[PDB]
Amino acid sequence: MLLNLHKKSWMEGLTLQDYVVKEMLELAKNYNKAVEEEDKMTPEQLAIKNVGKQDPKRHLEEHVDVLMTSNIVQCLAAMLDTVVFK
Amino acid sequence: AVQKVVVHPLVLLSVVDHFNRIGKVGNQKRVVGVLLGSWQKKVLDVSNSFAVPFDEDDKDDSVWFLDHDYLENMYGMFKKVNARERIVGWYHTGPKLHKNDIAINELMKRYCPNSVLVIIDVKPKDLGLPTEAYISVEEVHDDGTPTSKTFEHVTSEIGAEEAEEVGVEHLLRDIKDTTVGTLSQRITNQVHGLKGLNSKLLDIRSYLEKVATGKLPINHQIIYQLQDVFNLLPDVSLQEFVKAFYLKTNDQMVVVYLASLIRSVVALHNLINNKIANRDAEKKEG
Amino acid sequence: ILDKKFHGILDQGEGVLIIFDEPPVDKTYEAALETIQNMSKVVDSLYNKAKKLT
Amino acid sequence: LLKLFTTMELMRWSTLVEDYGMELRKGSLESPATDVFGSTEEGEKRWKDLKNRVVEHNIRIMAKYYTRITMKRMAQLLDLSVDESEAFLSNLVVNKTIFAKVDRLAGIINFQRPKDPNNLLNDWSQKLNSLMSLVNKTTHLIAKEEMIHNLQ
C-alpha cells in the first residue's frame, strides 16, 4: 500500500489527473534543435584518420533516449483526443 | 476553512497497527481513532495520530466511548513532546457512514471548529486513492428542521516529507520511476477510462435506479445541473466535431510533422552509431 | 514589396494587407544542415569501410 | 449615468440626448450643464466627446461581441451614418489599441484574435478544463453519492 501510495502520490498525477502536452513540445523542439546541433558538431571530429592512439576523453554523445521517450509521450498524448474522445 | 490536506502514511500504519491490536482479538472489529494535526496553513498537515479504545453499538447506534485520560493527558504528553502537533480531527473504519457519526461530529467540533474526520480502508486494492476527509458545516436544508450537521466532503490528497521511506522502499525494490511511454500512462488510461466510465455506469445505473425506485435527484438538482457541465459536448448522431474537423487536422499536423522530421533524425542518430561501432568492433578480428 | 520587404504579400481583396511569417522554423533548417555534413562523414568513412576489407 | 457604465444599454443616442439636454433646463443649477454641454466652446467638444464615447463604447463592448459582422449594418448601429464611418472608424484605428479587420468588397468585417495561430487551447480547454472537471465528477459524484446515501 505504500508502493501504491508512492507511485500514486510520491510520483505526481493521481492517474485520473494526467490524461505539458503542447508547450512542452515547443520547449522540446527547442530541445530537439539545441541538443541536435551539438550532437552534430562533435562526431565530425571522430577518428577520421588511421591513428593507433588510445587515450579517449569520454562524453558519450548519443542523445537518443530524450528524443525517444519524449516523442512517444508526444505521439500518445496527441492521441488523447481520439483516445479519451471516442 | 479546510480545503485540502497534507497527510503522510505514518497515520496509515498508525491505523494498521491498531488494526493489528483489535484484529486477532476481534470482537467489535473496528479501528476508530483520533487524528492529531499540525495545523499550519489553510492546507492541513498531519504527522501523528492515535487510536482511542472505542466501541460502537448497533441498537440506537449512538453508544460510543472515548477514554478522556487517554484523550486529554496523552494529548498533553504529546503536546509536551511536540507542541507543534495538536488536534485536528479523527478517523474510523467501516466506510458506510451511520448515525453516531454526527454525535462524534458534535464532540469533534468543540475541540476544533473546522474539524475533519477520516474514513479509511484497511485493504485498499483500489483504483486508487487513499482515505477520506470531510468538512462539517450547517446548510441546514430546504426542510426547516433544527440544525442539520450533514457531512460535506473535503477533497483529500497526500503530501510528503523528508526521510520517511528509507527502509520501506528499500524493502519493496519494485520501484520504477522513469518508464512513462509504455506502462505508466496506459495504467492511467485503463484507470480513468474504465474506472471513470464505470463510476459513470454507477451514475446512469444509480440514477436510473432513482428513476425506478429512489431519490430521483430533485432538490439536489446540482446532479443534472452538473451533468450539463458534462453536456458541454452533446455529440448528436454525427458526433459533432466537424467544426473541429480542420482543427483536429491542424492538431494532427504539428505532432505528425514532428514525428516525421524528428524520427527521421532519430534514425540518423541510431543507424550511424550502430553501423560504425559494429563495423569497427566486428572487423577487429584479433 | 519588390526590392525591399517587410514581408507584406499582395493582399488585394482583404482590407488589412496582413504582414505575417514565422522566421523561427530553423529546427528543420538545422537538421538539413546536419544531414549535409553527417553523410559527408559517412562517405569519408566509406573509404575505410570498402578499403580495409578488400 | 450609472446606466451608461456597464455595456451602456445598446440604445439610440438621441434618447440620452433628451435625458441630458433636459439638464440645461433643469433647476436653478445650470453651470455643470454649462461646463459640459452649455458651452459653444470646449463643452461642444464635450458633446463630440460624448459622440466619441458612444461610438467608442460600441467598439469597447462589441469588439468583445464580434464574430462576423457586415459593414453598413454596423455603421447604422453605431448611432451614426454609413459613409461617415470612414472618418468615424479611421479615428478608431488611430485609436490603434484594438487589433481589428475589415473587408470592403463584401462588407463582412470582424474584430477577433489574430487568426488562430495556436490551436492548442481548444484541446486544453476541452480536455483539461472540462474533462478534468469530469474526472472531478468522479471525486465529487461519489461525494454526492454519499450525500444521497446518507438517506440511502
Side-chain angles (χ1 to χ4, degrees), chain C residues 4-52:
Chain C
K4 300 296 182 183
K5 80 284 297 173
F6 48 87
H7 62 87
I9 189 61
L10 274 90
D11 194 0
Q12 177 181 1
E14 183 68 30
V16 180
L17 204 292
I18 301 173
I19 300 110
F20 70 102
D21 54 359
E22 291 293 327
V25 71
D26 51 351
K27 174 174 59 60
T28 311
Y29 294 162
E30 199 167 20
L33 296 175
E34 287 169 355
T35 59
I36 294 168
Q37 299 169 355
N38 284 124
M39 282 74 177
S40 74
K41 284 184 287 187
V42 174
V43 164
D44 287 326
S45 62
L46 299 181
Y47 292 101
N48 288 316
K49 294 174 187 295
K51 184 180 289 185
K52 72 195 298 295

Side-chain angles (χ1 to χ4, degrees), chain A residues 22-23 26, chain B residues 251, chain D residues 113 117-125:
Chain A
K22 185 62 68 175
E23 296 86 358
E26 303 169 353
Chain B
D251 289 330
Chain D
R113 176 182 169 182
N118 202 356
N119 50 2
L120 53 81
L121 201 144
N122 311 114
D123 195 7
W124 286 103
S125 67

Side-chain angles (χ1 to χ4, degrees), chain D residues 83-149:
Chain D
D83 197 8
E84 196 65 28
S85 293
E86 291 290 328
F88 281 173
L89 272 80
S90 297
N91 58 358
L92 298 170
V93 76
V94 303
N95 193 5
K96 75 181 176 60
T97 185
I98 291 98
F99 186 70
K101 184 174 287 183
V102 294
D103 181 73
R104 83 280 180 266
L105 55 81
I108 294 95
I109 73 165
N110 42 357
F111 297 178
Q112 78 282 23
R113 176 182 169 182
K115 197 192 288 183
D116 293 332
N118 202 356
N119 50 2
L120 53 81
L121 201 144
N122 311 114
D123 195 7
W124 286 103
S125 67
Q126 186 69 258
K127 292 295 186 293
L128 258 72
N129 197 358
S130 67
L131 273 72
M132 278 179 69
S133 177
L134 290 174
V135 305
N136 291 317
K137 291 286 276 290
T138 298
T139 70
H140 60 256
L141 263 68
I142 65 170
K144 290 189 290 298
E145 186 270 329
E146 292 290 330
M147 293 298 170
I148 64 174
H149 289 85

